Amino acid sequence: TFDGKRMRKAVNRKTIDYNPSVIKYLENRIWQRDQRDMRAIQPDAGYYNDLVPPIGMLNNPMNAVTTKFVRTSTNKVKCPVFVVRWTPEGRRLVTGASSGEFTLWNGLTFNFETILQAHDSPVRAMTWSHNDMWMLTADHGGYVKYWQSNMNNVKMFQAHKEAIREASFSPTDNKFATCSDDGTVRIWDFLRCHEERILRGHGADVKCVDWHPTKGLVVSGSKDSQQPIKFWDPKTGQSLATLHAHKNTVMEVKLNLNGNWLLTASRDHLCKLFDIRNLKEELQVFRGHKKEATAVAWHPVHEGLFASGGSDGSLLFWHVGVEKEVGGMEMAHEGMIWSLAWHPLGHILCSGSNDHTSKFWTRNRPGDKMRDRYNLNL
Amino acid sequence: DYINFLKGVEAVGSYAENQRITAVRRVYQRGCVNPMINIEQLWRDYNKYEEGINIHLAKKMIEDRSRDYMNARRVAKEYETVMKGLDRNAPSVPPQPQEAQQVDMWKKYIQWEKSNPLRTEDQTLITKRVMFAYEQCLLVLGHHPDIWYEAAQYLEQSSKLLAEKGDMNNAKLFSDEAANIYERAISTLLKKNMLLYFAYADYEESRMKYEKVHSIYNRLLAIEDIDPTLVYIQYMKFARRAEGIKSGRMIFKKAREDTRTRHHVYVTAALMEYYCSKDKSVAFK
Amino acid sequence: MQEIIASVDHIKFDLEIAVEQQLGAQPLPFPGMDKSGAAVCEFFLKAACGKGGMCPFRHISGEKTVVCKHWLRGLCKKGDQCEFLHEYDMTKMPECYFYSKFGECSNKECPFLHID
RNA sequence: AAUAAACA
Ligand SMILES: [Zn+2]
Ligand SMILES: [Zn+2]
Ligand SMILES: [Zn+2]
């Protein structure tokens, strides 16, 4: 058993510390005016001082192509992790497993901090707020819990009679939307736990929900090939649009924080950009996932780039304006990637398999050789 | 014949018997992906081997790889059509009616495998199947320069296509394979055929291995009965383009001292000086 | 030193008026919360506070002699029904479990108490 | 006290 009561030896820990990078940028940005003023991080291991976080190099977003492996983070009960979030302080990392546990993993140095028995069902959804206040979760059972920053259990309520698969949140603490496997998107009142409205007319089980950061748009994705992507209108309840995008089973749908770009993972080996103000045409598609693309996460301080999971555990990195992918791990993260979550500083990325593990991914260090088993197996 | 051989290998105990079970299972799972004639019979023997050792767990192990078999069984029926028309036994003859009609059935078989019946993004699985289509065609019509040329240009195309999508160590593997298919042309079957040299010369300029190129060009010059008048034009056209004007005139020095040389290199060289080095007097002299 | 030239000690700001009588703090939702990040309500120490259970700020009780070990990392499920203290005084910690039971400790910067 | 030590 594991209860913190038996003694273990003293150990130094694998540290990915952003503090020597963030301090460096503060010293920089005084005498830096742009990125065209920045001193170059020459490729050698001696230039470990000159790293700035990705806010320092807004230009050149290939900074945050996090292919350097850090740490497999596995539990002692070996359940496959589904959702992964960082605390918006960048302090820890709550992670959802099939037995309904929230293992809070550390941030600068990763250890473990506590276990929870949160859900009676496999966890399926996890989002924080725009302030750090409230965390939203959801599961296979239909129960949605509110969580604080100290992970207090708040009043829980059966939001759905069948398995929720997402929950995203309005630009406030007032409104959010959960889609489930009954096929509906139900938009919720935050405080009253009151069922505002049901967005029917969808056809089959909808497994993702997004909310547009300003305009109040609920975007969804579907297994139903007839009604795959629906925009919605949260105050009225009417179907605003319908976008026929994918041949089967749209997995995860994410909008930028700039408010224009729709991004859509799907089981036909594709990620697609849609400008949401022009649904007639189509922006670029993203080809390179040799099996199905099951997880997608936009980069926080770089609009333009995102990481894109695979059902073969393939972990790929893209960029808007760039047709083929940038980073690459194949046969490397083993299993089926369910979710990704960047650190708030966009410098270290997480993962999560259908195998029982959940690896962590920092940026490539200067002047190392990528002979690692993820990058070049030689 | 390897299925029955592994069963013929004597193993006593329980761990060595499970070593037999592991070895026979691996060839089963590999062979039931491969398109061929009797793929319906290998799976039939696969069903009886799983049920032959454990009936209960046979219902899962057959079911877990059955969907990939149904893709393998379907494309194998698609593979029958283009292969039933081919000969696969004719000697290699340079072109002189029926021969050009055979070439069309090869160009159909090349471009159909380029059409990717096994629809996938993995260019390594795409190319090596097209490379297997190339190697079968080079047995029957190896004295044709186009089948050698469309071979390695597909590898040059697959080199820059794998250079984009992350697979960097395999990008140079097909890139040196592109020089290899060009090497097999000039060394085995087509030694006096100039065209596959220059495709192999300009491929190595595109890989920026400029020291290797002079060995390629001078290999052709050592061959006795050719016309080096064309080669000295192109071997001057390399030196000006990659190494400068003075490197070009060293080639044109070697063009004057070869008996076999005709008048066309004297036309090219004055135009190489006038159009590139912008001089009229050297072009006049 | 900012307090010789632009001193503000004689100003009663509207900000200080906003935080004495708390200036309209809403009675917090979901009565199984923690009241975390909130300081104290002066309405409870002097007299009756007015609202019970569902109140924003913290209500303290006596006879707390040991500070809370979970609370330091930022994980307080109990809140004000906690049987342990929530200050930062480094004198009311528990005895370290591995120095009291299992001989010596392991780490070099153990905050917890080491008594012999 | 509710996983402080969750180790390779
Ligand atoms: Zn009070
Ligand atoms: Zn406490
Ligand atoms: Zn101690």
Could you tell me how many residues make up chain B?
285
Q: CB B165 to CB A324 under 8 A?
A: yes
Report the nearest residue to nucleotide D7, CA vs C1'.
Answer: A8
B126 contacts on A by Cβ (under 8 Å): none
Interface probe, candidates C77, C96, C99, C108, chain A, greatest A C-beta count within 10 A? C77
The candidate with the shortest Cα–Cα distance to B206, out of B159, B145, B273, is: B159
Please give the torsion angle defined by the CA atoms of residues B74, B77, B82 and B88, in that order, rounded to the nearest 10 degrees.
120
Which residues lie below 8 Å from residue A322, measured CB to CB, with a gap of 6+? none
CA A35/CA B263 separation, integer angstroms: 59
Residues A265 and A250 sit within 8 Å (Cβ to Cβ): yes
Q: Strand order in A135-139's β-sheet?
A: A123-127, A135-139, A146-147
How are beta strands A315-319 and A146-147 bridged, if at all?
Answer: unpaired
Cβ-based contacts (< 7 Å) between A 80-139 and strand D: 103, 111-115
Dihedrals φ, ψ of A210, to 5°?
-120, 165
**Considering only CA atoms, which of A105, A301, A127 is closest in space to residue A208?**
A127
**B and C in touch (3+ CB pairs within 8 angstroms):** no
- Does strand D come within 7 Å of the CB of A4? yes
CB neighbour list of residue A214: distance below 8 Å, 6 or more residues apart? A171, A259
CA separation for the pair A244, A123 (Å, rounded)? 29
> Which amino acid, residue A244?
H
The whole-angstrom separation of Cα A99 and Cα A152 is: 19
Residue C77 Cβ < 7 Å to strand D: yes
Starting from the CA of residue C99, give the closest ligand: 3
CATH number of domain containing B256: 1.25.40.10
- Residue A216 CA to residue A144 CA, distance in Å, equals 21
Q: Which two tokens stand for residue B168?
A: 């960097």
Residue A8: CB atoms within 10 Å:
9
The span from the CA of A339 to the CA of A126, in Å, is 10
In which residue are the tokens 């850090």 written? A70
Task: Return the H-helix or E-strand segment holding C46.
Answer: helix C42-46
Residue pair A255/A274 in contact by the 8 Å Cβ criterion? no
Torsion of CA C104, C109, C112, C115, to 10 degrees: 40
Please spell the DSSP secondary structure of A21-38, one letter per residue: HHHHHHHHHHH--SSTTP
**Structure tokens belonging to residue B81:** 């059509």
Residues in chain A closer than 8 A to C75 (CB atoms): 113-114, 150-151
Helix (H, G, I), strand (E, B) or coil at C14: helix
The range of the structural domain enclosing residue B208 comes to 66-285
- Measure the CA–CA gap between A189 and A176, rounded to whole angstroms: 7
For residue C85, the 8-state DSSP code is B
Phi and psi at B265, nearest 5°, equal -80, -20
**At a CB cut-off of 8 Å and minimum separation 6, what does A95 contact?**
A73, A81, A83, A84, A85, A102, A103, A104, A105, A350, A352, A358
The Cα–Cα gap between A191 and A158 comes to 15
Q: Which residue in this structure is represented by tokens 């941030």?
A: A107
Method: cryo-EM
Residue C109 CA: which ligand is closest?
3
**Cβ proximity of A256 and A271 under 8 Å:** no
Q: Rounded to whole angstroms, how far apart are CA atoms C6 and C14? A: 18
Task: Give me the count of residues in chain C.
Answer: 116
Q: Does B164 lie at the interface with A, CB-CB under 8 angstroms?
A: yes
A148: its two tokens: 């604080």
Q: Which two structure tokens, joined as six digits, stand for B194?
A: 């100039």
Query: What is d(CA A191, CA A173) in angstroms, rounded to the nearest whole number?
Result: 8
- Using CA coordinates, name the residue in chain B closest to A315: B166
- The experimental resolution of this structure, in angstroms, equals 3.6
CB contact under 8 A, A153 and C77: yes
Q: How many CB atoms lie within 10 A of CB B168?
A: 15
- How would you classify residue A325: left for phi > 0, otherwise alpha for psi between -120 and 50, otherwise beta? beta
A152/C106 touch (CB, cutoff 8 Å), yes or no? no
Spell out the SS3 assignment of chain B.
CCHHHHHHCCCCCCHHHHHHHHHHHHHHHHHCCCCCCCHHHHHHHHHHHHHHHCHHHHHHHHHHCHHHHHHHHHHHHHHHHHHCCCCCCCCCCCCCCCHHHHHHHHHHHHHHHHCCCCCCCCHHHHHHHHHHHHHHHHHHCCCCHHHHHHHHHHHHHHHHHHHHCCCCCCHHHHHHHHHHHHHHHHHHHCCCCCHHHHHHHHHHHHCCCHHHHHHHHHHHHCCCCCCHHHHHHHHHHHHHHHHCHHHHHHHHHHHHCCCCCCCHHHHHHHHHHHHHCCCCHHHHC
A neighbours by CB contacts (3+ pairs under 8 Å): B, C
